Amino acid sequence: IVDRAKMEDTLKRRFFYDQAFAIYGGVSGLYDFGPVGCALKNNIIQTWRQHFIQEEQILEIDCTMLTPEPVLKTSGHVDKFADFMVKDVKNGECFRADHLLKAHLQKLMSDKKCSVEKKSEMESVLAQLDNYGQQELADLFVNYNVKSPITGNDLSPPVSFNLMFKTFIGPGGNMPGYLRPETAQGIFLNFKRLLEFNQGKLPFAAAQIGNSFRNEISPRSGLIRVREFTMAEIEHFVDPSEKDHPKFQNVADLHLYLYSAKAQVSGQSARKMRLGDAVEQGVINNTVLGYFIGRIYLYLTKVGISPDKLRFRQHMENEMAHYACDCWDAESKTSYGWIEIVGCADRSCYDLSCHARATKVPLVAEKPYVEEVVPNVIEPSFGLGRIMYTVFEHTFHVREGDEQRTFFSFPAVVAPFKCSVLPLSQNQEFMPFVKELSEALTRHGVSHKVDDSSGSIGRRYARTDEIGVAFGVTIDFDTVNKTPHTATLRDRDSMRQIRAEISELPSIVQDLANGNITWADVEARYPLFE
Amino acid sequence: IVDRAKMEDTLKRRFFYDQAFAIYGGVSGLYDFGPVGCALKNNIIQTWRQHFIQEEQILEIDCTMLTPEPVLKTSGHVDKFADFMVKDVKNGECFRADHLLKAHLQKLMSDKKCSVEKKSEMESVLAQLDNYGQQELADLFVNYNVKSPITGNDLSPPVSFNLMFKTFIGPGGNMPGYLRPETAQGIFLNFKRLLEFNQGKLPFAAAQIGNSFRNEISPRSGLIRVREFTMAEIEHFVDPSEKDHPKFQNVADLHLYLYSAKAQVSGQSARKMRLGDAVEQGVINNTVLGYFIGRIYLYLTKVGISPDKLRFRQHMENEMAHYACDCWDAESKTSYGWIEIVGCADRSCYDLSCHARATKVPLVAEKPYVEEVVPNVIEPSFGLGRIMYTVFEHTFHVREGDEQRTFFSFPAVVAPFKCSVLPLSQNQEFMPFVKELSEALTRHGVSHKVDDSSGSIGRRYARTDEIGVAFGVTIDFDTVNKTPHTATLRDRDSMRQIRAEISELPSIVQDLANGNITWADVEARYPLFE
Ligand SMILES: Nc1ncnc2c1ncn2[C@@H]1O[C@@H](COP(=O)(O)OP(=O)(O)OP(=O)(O)OP(=O)(O)OC[C@@H]2O[C@@H](n3cnc4c(N)ncnc43)[C@H](O)[C@H]2O)[C@H](O)[C@H]1O
Ligand SMILES: Nc1ncnc2c1ncn2[C@@H]1O[C@@H](COP(=O)(O)OP(=O)(O)OP(=O)(O)OP(=O)(O)OC[C@@H]2O[C@@H](n3cnc4c(N)ncnc43)[C@H](O)[C@H]2O)[C@H](O)[C@H]1O
Numbered sequence A, B: 001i002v003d004r005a006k007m008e009d010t011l012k013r014r015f016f017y018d019q020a021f022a023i024y025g026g027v028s029g030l031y032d033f034g035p036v037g038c039a040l041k042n043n044i045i046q047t048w049r050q051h052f053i054q055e056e057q058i059l060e061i062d063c064t065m066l067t068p069e070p071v072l073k074t075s076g077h078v079d080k081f082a083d084f085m086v087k088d089v090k091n092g093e094c095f096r097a098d099h100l101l102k103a104h105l106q107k108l109m110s111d112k113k114c115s116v117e118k119k120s121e122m123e124s125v126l127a128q129l130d131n132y133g134q135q136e137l138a139d140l141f142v143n144y145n146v147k148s149p150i151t152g153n154d155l156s157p158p159v160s161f162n163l164m165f166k167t168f169i170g171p172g173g174n175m176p177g178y179l180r181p182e183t184a185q186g187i188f189l190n191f192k193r194l195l196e197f198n199q200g201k202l203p204f205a206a207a208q209i210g211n212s213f214r215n216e217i218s219p220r221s222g223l224i225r226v227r228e229f230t231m232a233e234i235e236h237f238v239d240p241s242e243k244d245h246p247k248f249q250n251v252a253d254l255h256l257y258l259y260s261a262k263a264q265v266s267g268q269s270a271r272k273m274r275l276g277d278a279v280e281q282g283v284i285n286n287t288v289l290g291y292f293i294g295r296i297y298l299y300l301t302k303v304g305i306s307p308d309k310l311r312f313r314q315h316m317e318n319e320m321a322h323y324a325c326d327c328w329d330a331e332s333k334t335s336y337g338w339i340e341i342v343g344c345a346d347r348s349c350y351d352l353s354c355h356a357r358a359t360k361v362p363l364v365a366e367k368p369y370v371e372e373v374v375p376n377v378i379e380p381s382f383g384l385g386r387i388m389y390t391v392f393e394h395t396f397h398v399r400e401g402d403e404q405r406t407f408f409s410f411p412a413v414v415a416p417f418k419c420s421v422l423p424l425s426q427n428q429e430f431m432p433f434v435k436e437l438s439e440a441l442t443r444h445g446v447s448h449k450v451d452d453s454s455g456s457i458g459r460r461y462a463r464t465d466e467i468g469v470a471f472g473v474t475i476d477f478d479t480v481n482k483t484p485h486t487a488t489l490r491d492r493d494s495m496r497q498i499r500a501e502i503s504e505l506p507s508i509v510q511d512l513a514n515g516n517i518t519w520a521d522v523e524a525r526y527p528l529f530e
Helices: A004-013 A035-056 A069-075 A097-110 A116-126 A134-143 A184-188 A191-197 A261-265 A275-281 A287-303 A350-359 A384-395 A431-443 A457-466 A505-513 A519-525 B004-013 B035-056 B069-075 B097-110 B116-126 B134-143 B184-188 B191-197 B261-265 B275-281 B287-303 B350-359 B384-395 B431-443 B457-466 B505-513 B519-525
Strands: A017-019 A031-033 A066-068 A082-087 A094-096 A159-162 A166-168 A176-179 A204-213 A228-238 A255-259 A271-274 A310-314 A327-334 A337-345 A365-367 A371-373 A376-383 A396-398 A406-408 A419-423 A448-450 A471-475 A486-491 A497-501 B017-019 B031-033 B066-068 B082-087 B094-096 B159-162 B166-168 B176-179 B204-213 B228-238 B255-259 B271-274 B310-314 B327-334 B337-345 B365-367 B371-373 B376-383 B396-398 B406-408 B419-423 B448-450 B471-475 B486-491 B497-501
Touching (some): A004 A017, A035 A204, A035 A287, A035 A384, A069 A184, A069 A350, A082 A134, A097 A116, A166 B166, A184 A191, A184 A204, A184 A228, A184 A350, A228 A287, A255 A287, A271 A275, A275 A287, A287 A327, A287 A337, A287 A384, A310 A337, A327 A384, A337 A384, A376 A384, A384 A396, A419 A431, A471 A505, A486 A505, A486 A519, A505 A519, B004 B017, B004 B406, B035 B228, B035 B287, B069 B176, B069 B350, B082 B097, B094 B097, B097 B116, B184 B191, B184 B204, B191 B204, B228 B384, B255 B287, B275 B287, B287 B327, B287 B337, B287 B376, B327 B384, B337 B384, B384 B406, B406 B457, B419 B457, B431 B448, B471 B505, B486 B519, B505 B519
Parallel strands (some): B255 B310, B419 B471
Antiparallel strands (some): A066 A176, A082 A094, A082 A159, A228 A376, A310 A327, A327 A337, A365 A371, A396 A406, A486 A497, B166 B176, B255 B271, B337 B376
């Protein structure tokens, strides 16, 4: 439960992000990231690089965004990559039928005049929205007589709208192209050279961290629905008969909420199972999928996503992506409800075969005399933007004070900068201490910034808390004149303080940020300071 | 003088980069970067972040690539951002008139039948190619009767071709847009919030590191001419009356080749002046421009660009970009001749005014009672791709041996990974040493990789040299069985070796890579090893 309004005001005021081309009216689905937004975004990307690429020794490549039409036609995007769209016969307003129908039912379930039986009927309908096809969705639009949310007009029947941006490569219109809606294709077209890196053996994973474009019909979810974003995609090529991951046992003991396809059709809630158990019973197909689901859980959690607002939902029969057979999405509970922030599909051998057949170029591998096989690929897809937004709503808090101050309980690994060093005076009296502390923090690899802003220490930290700085060190006169020279350490979340010699604080902060020590531990060793 | 052919073969074989969508015929102007290509590209970006953003405390932002037409129409790109194009009346082959005329004259100057007087005439023409306008270029195409390079056909008159990619944002064609040809605009539309970070005082700089698109007419220069690339742009906002940079004296003593507009019109060669002297005489307008020209020189140099193949060329009167008044480009001598890899324009107050007037939104600042002013901006534009390519041609070498091996003398700060650790056996006998060395190197922040490839040590390093690994440590039996336990250190460029205790090598390599010690110094302290 978060006050989106108040938050968007803080994120825009401190400039995490904001409307792109604001002075022109702004384009929906487009936003720019300010200084703190980039710092946070970079921390999230770097953390991701460590968690996956570095942890699994994934091969990295950087493919182009521009894509010639033939490529996307083969992958099947030109035909299936789209959302159903509607528009009132009056003017040309377009809406994503998928979501309009959802906002309409929620409207009816909110009206007190709604009976219990109908409320239930509608709930069952929403829990199957991603299944309904061209026709099924057309009927519901009639049964509920759905009409334009603005000055209720009559909506035309739901039709498919390809989400890919169109363009022309080079002069003339002989080579029409698109902006890649995902990165996966780039890795597939370079399968041979990539497979070659691993001696030609399976399994192995390739990844990409770049921009993708989706000409979203009607973006109205802030950063949740942009037409341009950064995504990290991992393509894990494995033997279709060796779909077993050697490291699964590393996450087999995690307890996370799973919402299987069955539980969705049988109308029951999601369960909090143990990964290992989930695979045993058959809920989660194999262990390769199970490993990544665990690593994903760990990543999102480490970055700041709340376990109580995180779950993995499996796709339904006809919800499947045109390229997948099985899939699980990491959805986060937000002010916009449950939304996927990480897609993890098991798109068998769809891709490699399509390109192989179309280009007349074989894309396979061998196994022991020797047999050739088309690697099944599990694709963990990360929408960094959505992941960051979720972090905002899950760590945004209002201080218990009339002044209505706000702060983000950002984990030390993602916060703009771990420590904030703020002295009272700037005279050559404090510099000797500020300089030393700063450099000391630098030797400990602790990002920091010397606060100069005007106002009382309390007001100084107020700004620090707004952008989620994890810790702060106050350097007052008792630090310069008294001896031993001690400074004040402040915990962002609790606002509680500590007093210790300014030469020891560096290592203390380091351990606090690296999770080697608890704020509790700190209060146990050093004297409290109010 | 480099054998482009042989090089492109090594860059593509080891997978630094290669044709994008290769299995489809490949699209010109598009390439993908493989593992080593990304490692190198990332090192170049990181080095750039340290050199500029971190060194000048530049504010970073990340704007969108999609841009609504009105924005680019105001900036003047919709009208002036283009290259002159020609095409043979026969088929529809398009060519950049600018470059075709250049390739034609070079052809005539190469034929022995060419007289000295005409050769001179043509040289004077090429040294003014970027000045010739719509008409002047049309006449030359007649005087020299330029015809299609392929099966000589008759070329149509030179016409302007807007280099911007076209697209439509959202459903329908009511909001036509483009892909940003540069990033600068993004910073300008966010001038108010950016100026706000600096208390509203000048000067201050904002920067962006992202992708830009240029629908290049006929790309045929490898990575030199792509339709999609990564660029780092710095927008340095300064008081039009305070165009003086406080740090200029930090680079005032650099000797670099300058090729002023005069020297280009007066038909004389470029001079190797001292930055300070250059500003004195008035060659380089102010010191703000002089500082950046120095920092740029230092950056390119540190990354691997050869000083003897680097120069800064000033634009001519009508060569000016539609948004600039003065400018200097860092051009590198390559197999494609001199090409700009860094643009440094002094586009006064063109931008801020244009957007202010069009949006009816003021974009100014104040100065001491107080006067408002439109900040003059100096834009150092970096084409990371071109900078990396230049590094390739300037560090690519062929070993003096029949086998024709190749290697890149990459500076330690940009090489894929600084040290290569390669043992003879993998048995539990060597592991204790390999493990220790590896971790030790990690504690010293020295990137490395344990070589496993088969073949003799000499053949092992052959692969290491190909991707430019700076150093190598050989761990043989005399390392495991003998005592003290010593290993062999190998310099990539010289291939000369050294023998020292395996516990001291970590710090030795660190200093060698961080430029704290010379390979000469090493051979002076430790015993040589053949
Ligand atoms: N019968 C049917 N036929 C065809 N389609 C059917 C269908 N039934 C249901 N559908 C669904 O309709 C499509 C709607 O797509 P979208 O328009 O992208 O809406 P979405 O469901 O919120 O994102 P999506 O699910 O596509 O993200 P993805 O896995 O591609 O990639 C991974 C995601 O990328 C990121 N991401 C996606 N869109 C983003 C955006 N606009 N902004 C920021 N991040 C985004 C997310 O963080 C990450 O989870 C779904 O792809 C498809 O499953
Ligand atoms: N009268 C006139 N009217 C209009 N135009 C006239 C003119 N007389 C001459 N011209 C010239 O014609 C245009 C041709 O442009 P381009 O088509 O980009 O060719 P260029 O000169 O090699 O690059 P450019 O000079 O544009 O790079 P820029 O400063 O924008 O940005 C910085 C560069 O970005 C990078 N970069 C640019 N293009 C790249 C590419 N295709 N691939 C990779 N990197 C690229 C480079 O590394 C970096 O130096 C020049 O912009 C303009 O000066």
